[PDB]
Each structure stands twice: as C-alpha cells, then as structure tokens.
C-alpha cells in the first residue's frame, strides 16, 4: 500500500504526526478529509509537503496569500505536493511521484491555514 489516510478536524489537529512512504512505491497518495462542522474560512485545512528547510517560508508566504489562494503562494516551487483547502464535509486527495523525495533530506507536512501549522504538522520519511 502506497497511501495514507489523514483527517484534520475542528480542534485544529491532524490525526498523525509521522508519515512513512515505502521507498519502493512509484507514486504515493495522501487522502485528506474533514470530519468537523466548521466552515472552510474558520477551520479549513490542507495537507502540504515541503522540506524542513522550506516549511516556515511556505507557511509565512501562504498566510500573506490568504484564504482566497488556499493559504499558499501560487506556483510555489518549494511545495512538493499539496491538497486543496477543505472545510467541513469535504475531502481531497493528492498523489505525487516518490522520485521527488530524496534520501538524506528532511520533509515535513503541515496545514498552511493561518496559524494552523503550529499544531498541525509532522514528518514525512522514506523507508
Ligand atoms: Cu488547518
């Protein structure tokens, strides 16, 4: 299996803080869903992948871009993979090539929604 299921909920939480990608997968899929009640503008989430090196920069410029851009600088080359921003009752999936991921590199996933990254983040690692 070359996928993971992850939820972002109304208490500003992902349901994992460490994802592992089997390094023999050609592609890997992240299936994000929102089990809450709150509207997208107040507790909307996305799942965003970057290097540890780029995480805060992505989060900072993302907050500048704001809700109307899904809290991501458009065409940000630092974002390896991301889902759409989703609100209550919604789900989005993103697939990327495992060849984008390098050995000897540190990757972090996080929600880019304003202020959410502090709580909503973890590591992604090939194994
Ligand atoms: Cu969020």
In short:
With 127 residues, the chain is mainly beta. The protein contains 2 helices and 8 strands; from the N terminus they run βββαβαββββ.
Q: Write the CATH architecture name.
A: Sandwich
Q: List the ligand species.
A: copper (II) ion
For the CA atoms, what is the radius of gyration?
Answer: 13 Å
CATH class type = Mainly Beta
How do the helices and strands follow one another from N- to C-terminus?
EEEHEHEEEE
Figure out the total of helices: 2
Ends distance: 13 Å
**How many domain modules?**
1
Describe this structure in words.
It is classed as metal binding protein. Keywords: cupredoxin fold, metal-binding, protein:protein interaction, metal binding protein. Strands 2-8-7-4-5 form a five-stranded mixed beta sheet, with no helix packed on it. It has a three-stranded mixed beta sheet with strand order 1-3-6, with no helix packed on it. The chain is built from two helices and eight strands; from the N terminus they run E-E-E-H-E-H-E-E-E-E. With 127 residues, it is mainly beta. The longest helix has 11 residues. Bound molecules: copper (II) ion.
